[PDB]
Symmetry: D2
Subunit: 215 residues, 4 copies
């Protein structure tokens, strides 16, 4: 089965955990996958591991600062330059707090918001600019548990519902995934399998909503 | 692809619309499908149409009164008798009101509750009795738009969340589907494709929640 | 303070618990209160207790079968006959299951649905017929925890949202209350205080939604 | 009636709209009110207008940068210094986007997040440090419509639910308000009346949830 056959796909946070599991599952299902990661070194490690699994598959990797819309746009532009289009944007990157509320620093809080909310907005915005005249595309936003208490989780859910209803006219689907607690309990593959379904044409009826995955 | 290969499946309201579309899609994906319908004549018409499409496929059909837990249990028992087990219960049957609130009769309202809430509870309860010692199973509850204003929709959603968390221990998944407006606009296949994903092992991480399908 | 001064109010399930606490609080706040209860004997006991607290207050009591829309309409008609109008309908009556899901009888389940969903619909429908030409009124629906696991809770929430948006044009507010676990932990007064606020003109901006009171 | 008698209250964004309406209503109901605003000049204008209405009432005003947790903490510290305590924190300040999604600038988006999410977190965190040993307090978070499409709205809702459940042990209530479209349609007083109820002891049963005020 090849549920995402020939779908040009970007996976943010694609060097570890759910993201990396999604990269494998998407390659298995016929996608043309590119990963974004935190640093180019982490990206290159993940690309080497993917090459161990899929020696014949081309996989691009980039490390834009997700908090910079310009950097995200440049990296999206390179993917579109290679393949001519972007079919699926998976805003999967997210972080968790070290601390509970009473002890979280202003700097940690803003950093969580920066990755979990601004990063997802940036990925969605950039993917939209790329897909808006194609009358086809899927943007999947991951609403990860904040660690603090969630706040960032609910923001991505709101982002997903609002954006989905606003651009429904353009035939771009926008869908969320709210995972529970994952193993480095859900396995990462169990979340990635949901990405897979949502990216596929089997989910053509699903937009402007978020799927809870708990299990 | 055979996302529900060898899954013994019952689809309520399986003679028309979403239900019938699900019957076809499930047969295509390797399931052993049985349909329940409103009357045995409607069931036999649907079975004849399925035989036109799949001349070699065995498909059982029954017409238990969904408001009678005993009748539902008997029909579930016949399926388990044929196949030795029940893997997937799809409580898809639902009805819509003729009238808006101010004009709906007490009799129409109770009838909607009877099919849309009691019928789904009966199907879920009966499927649970059948699956409870198997440590495997999926119950999918459809929360259809009431027509009145939903009420029945939200009841099935609550039923799905409560039941799912209660029997999570038994490794039975319980999931809901809340479809939007369907064409006799979403096509029925677009809803049935969600049933398919949720019945499959790709949805192993999904339980005690409802997926909105609007689109 | 007299937050519901001269508001003609009906409280279903008004002989015990939250309902009875609401009767007292509403009388204290200047309402003209009538209670509905399960039987006329229970009603008369509650009326005697209210007279102990408020010797000068008139309080009517009725015991319509909440599952019979005709009986509810007759009892609403008597209140409107006494006072000329109905300002506030509080569909507070609800029951809980003895049993968990696997052991609940078909008869217990239908009885819970009958009181918790049909009864609330009947109260809302009857109050609407009474209030629809007044361009003023509040219907408060209580969505109580099913006891089973939810189902009835979510149905009343859906009922409240749908009905509220449908009759917003008529300047009738429809609002829900979803209480947590109450003491015969929340005290009953803590729920009744929310009824009070929602019935008052301070809640004029609140309709087609449900307030959770947990905690 | 004096629903918040002697409650030391801070209202962010208290110089206009809902905030200013809340200042008046809270003063009327016996609170000791302090307002935070965008600039000290806007604050002084609002204080002059409040003095026109309440010549004998003391009202403090501050203009901390809500995006700076240190500045918010200093201003909360001045209020606690004047009155010895903080009873009610109302994180009411919020902004709306000029632009829809496709045209919103990275700078506008971050600014909205900064006020609508970081500002509310800062206010809540600072109020918590102040109230945590008092075993009494209310934090009200306003989840305002983003303007963009939601995102900030859902983040405050998540913040409110998570924080409320985390500090329920401390007898500090945390509650949200999600207003609809307001007149400079709901009037600002209709939202402020909800703040009033939620700050009062009538809402003692309400925490870790958000009230929608639409309507
Ligand atoms: Cl390969
Ligand atoms: Cl065949
Ligand atoms: Cl008296
Ligand atoms: Cl004064």
């Amino acid at each position: 089965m090849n549920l995402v056959q020939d779908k040009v796909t970007i996976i943010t946070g694609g060097t570890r955990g759910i993201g990396f599991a999604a990269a494998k599952i998407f390659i298995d299902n016929g996608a043309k996958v590119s990963i974004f990661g935190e640093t180019q070194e982490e990206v290159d490690t993940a690309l080497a591991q993917l090459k161990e699994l899929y020696p014949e598959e081309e996989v691009l990797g980039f490390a834009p600062d997700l908090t910079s819309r310009d950097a995200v746009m440049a990296a999206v532009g390179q993917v579109a330059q290679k393949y001519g289009r972007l079919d699926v944007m998976i805003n999967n990157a997210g972080i968790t707090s070290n601390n509970v509320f009473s002890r979280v620093s202003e700097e940690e809080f803003k950093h969580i918001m920066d990755i979990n909310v601004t990063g997802v907005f940036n990925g969605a915005w950039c993917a939209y600019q790329c897909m808006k005249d194609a009358k086809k595309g899927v943007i999947i936003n991951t609403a990860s548990v904040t660690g603090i208490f969630p706040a960032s989780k609910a923001s991505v859910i709101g982002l997903t519902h609002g954006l989905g209803r606003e651009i429904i006219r353009k035939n771009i689907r926008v869908v969320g995934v709210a995972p529970g607690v994952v193993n480095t309990m859900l396995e990462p593959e169990e979340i990635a399998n949901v990405y897979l379904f949502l990216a596929s044409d089997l989910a053509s009826g699903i937009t402007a909503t978020t799927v809870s995955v708990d299990g």
